[model samples]
Target: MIDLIVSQGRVADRAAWMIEGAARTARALEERYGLKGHYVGEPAPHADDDWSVALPQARETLVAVREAATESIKGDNLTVLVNNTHSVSLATLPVVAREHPDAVVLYIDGHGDFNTPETTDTGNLHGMVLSGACGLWDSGHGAGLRPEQAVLVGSRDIDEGERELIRKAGVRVIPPGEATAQAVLDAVKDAPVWISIDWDVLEPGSIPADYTVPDGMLPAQIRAVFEAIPAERLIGVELAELNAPADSERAEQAVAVILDMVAPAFDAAAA
Candidate 1:
């Protein structure tokens, strides 16, 4: 069975559309594949509040992430979280790692989420999730996942600081538009892997998302990577940054693309 967890993140104002799309996608998954799908986690009280009140909201969201992830992990089902923003990974990935120490991370995103608080120019928590996952920060609870265990693909918009951290952390980065199924398989080898995909990794207009960069991989190419991963080696998955369009047609197109990316894992879980 597969569990689709819908979370309204700290940036809900900017990512509110993500949960709506998630619900629609969840329904499609349940109807077509018989996967268990439902929404969880409340929107942070400060989700739409003023910027100055961000810290408290973030803390609350983190707690919610940990709680939700804990519950999901305890179950036998393969968990697929539809997160509003990538920041939720700060808590979710760590829990997955601690429970499955041999697991590897396949981080597919347009930007490097490897920045630390000191290195980040924007101070956006989404940019720092990978750092926290790799124990680069003092988040109190660490995933203990090494940098070498992470394979960053579709990273083309990273800055110098982020690049330096990636280098220092020993994480392998495959530049945008250059990732291949074989390359990703080689990175994770035979270890069970968790996938975290930010929809902006796909070519612009392929999906309606919050961030877009030039020269991203095509939808087929990303799907190929998922298809190539060994089923038994696949553990958990999460889809993030899906800012679906208000127009019904465009929104359906976006959800269709997401379902394609997730189809490989659905096959794995069922088997």
Candidate 2:
């Protein structure tokens, strides 16, 4: 069974629609796939600053969730984390890495989350997630993910510093149109994989998100990647950056769209 982990608003105020939409997605998943959304803990209690408050809370929450997941189950059960903002990923992805040291992080997003604390101009923890994950920064969370096992797909708006870091780390950066399932499989090469999807990677207007870039990948294209992933090889999946929609109806509809796109992969896992 797929276990759902809901982590909301570590760094910023979560849009009400996002939390509502995520709950809706959980209910739909339970109805369709027998998966229940489980809360890790209360949502980090509101905070301030970019790194001072948020990053610490994120780290704490991630550690808590990691412990919870480990205690709850064992073996290859897939964990699906629904994060209100992408920043929560600073906590989510590493949890998988801690368990599967050889896991490949297939990061699907518009921007490279590869900035180190020194290189980050905005000090946004979200931008530094991959950097921390790959051990480019000292997140103070164990040995960190191996950079050689990281593959970035659909990145269009990357900082020069981030690009250099990704290149230096030998992380593969595949453009949206070119990110194929075969390419992904080739990148990981039989290693266990953890998939992280930031909804902002979708084309503008495709989803209500924190940020949008022009000419992003289509939902179908993203679906194809997941379809190509061998279910047994996938350890965990995380969805982030789903902002509040214009209305409740619109938000649920957007969440439904995401469910429709990825359901096939989950079904394949069950099969």
Candidate 3:
């Protein structure tokens, strides 16, 4: 009964491809595990758009996550995986954390994504999402999730400002080089973990994704990393940023890796 909420982020050219890849992964999840979930869609943002759509998606995500966490499962079990694309709305996180107090967020990305509004150079909401989640943002809507409740992995590219934010937030930051297949498993072995994979996290040739330039984790490496993670701790995962300009192969690789990571979960269910 795992719910996969695919946040179809806004992007004119890439949005369609994102939806396609996410839908493909969702279908694979359903087929392999007999799981029920939805491919939640979102409209693309325009160059001149105020970016209201991104905030609403965040709000909607909070509502959905809250419902999922509170609903009675076989026992007190729940977790949430979020697509960190779109704007990093600092407002919805607190509400989400309040409603689903037990939920933990895991971010898998190439960039640190620890920048706050004042320090963000590109104004990319994606990079600032963690700040919102950490409650470092000035907005009240931000969740300000405790540093221990969040884990940022696969962080290769970092800057001075973002570095400072990381230090200030005090959240667990596992660099790409340090995130060996075994290291990740050891960390989440006994915890319910929500995963976010920014396609850029992989090595150039390993994954060969659409948006990521090159040198990404291969399907094998990705699977190995995930396999070590116990299903008991793994609640759900989110795959983000499939830039089609690179190639369909990148998206295909993501789909394959996702299935690989969740293979254990599916197997345990059937057993």
Candidate 4:
């Protein structure tokens, strides 16, 4: 039984729609397959808690969920960690590595997320996550990631500093310009990959979201990325940064994109 962990608080706007979209997708997955969705978010008190600190809460929730899953499901069963780019992944991602030590830590996003503390220009924690995961950056206050087993996908826009950090960490970058899915798949061949999708990675018009770069991957390319990914070798996939308010078509298409690629893995169930 695969597990989906959904988060709605990280996107700048479109919280309500994102929540609904996530739920709809979760229901569809559960209905078709016997898989489960562990919806984790700040309830009454933590709803407005802010992004910088949300990872701790999310981490705790995921720990319990993973523990329960390990007890209830097969030990080898997979878990997908879908996250919004704006939140602090450092707090939770390292824990993911620790808990599922054998599982590949897959990450999909729009940016490189390879920036370190010194290289960070905006002080945005998101950019520093992959570095932290690779044991490069210290969250300074204590939270950060030890990156030994992490792969980055759907990277379209990246700063020079971030690029340098990515190169140093030896993290693989799946650029948007790579037209053929076969080429992308060749790059990720047989590695236990953790897939992370940041919708803004697609071409500007196609994505119609993200305030960052205009470049985005086409839906076909997105589907190819999924199809190219060998299921047995695929550890987990997380989809995020979907600003649903901008375009419902693209937003739902994004979810469909995953469903299309992971069609066999995702069984559509009744509501």
Q: Write the residue-wise lDDT of candidate 4 on 76-152 in tens digits.
A: 55555445433435545555565555544546667877777587676555566667666686543233333435656
lDDT (CA) per prediction: 0.75, 0.73, 0.56, 0.55
The runs of at least 3 residues in candidate 3 whose Cα sits more than 4 Å from the true structure, single-residue gaps closed, are 9-16, 45-104, 138-141, 185-190, 205-216, 244-253, 269-271
Off by over 4 Å in 2: 12-17, 44-48, 245-247
Instruction: List ranges where model 4 is wrong by over 4 Å.
Output: 8-21, 31-35, 43-74, 84-92, 99-106, 140-149, 207-209, 245-254, 264-271
* TM-score of model number 4: 0.72
Instruction: State how far residue 42 of model 1 sits from its true place (Å).
Output: 2.6
**Cα lDDT tens digits for candidate 2, 1-271:** 6777775435443344555545556666777777666765454444335764566666666676666556533555677777666666665556667777888888999999899888989776778878877778777664467788788899999988888998899989988888877777788898988888988788888677767689788998888888888887888777877765444666767777888777866776544
Say which candidate scores most in lDDT: 1
Using all chains and alpha carbons, the TM-scores for the candidates as numbered come to: 0.89, 0.89, 0.74, 0.72
Model 2 TM-score on a 0 to 1 scale:
0.89
Between prediction 1 and prediction 2, the one with superior lDDT is 1
- lDDT, candidate 1, 1-271, per-residue tens: 7767776655423545765655666666777677665555565433443322453466665676678777877788787887777777877888888888888899999888888878867656667788888989855445588888888988899899889999988999987656987788778888988899988888898776667688898888778887998777777788877766455786788877777877887877865
By TM-score, the better pick of 1 and 4 is: 1
| Model 4, backbone clash pairs (residues 3+ apart or across chains), number | 19
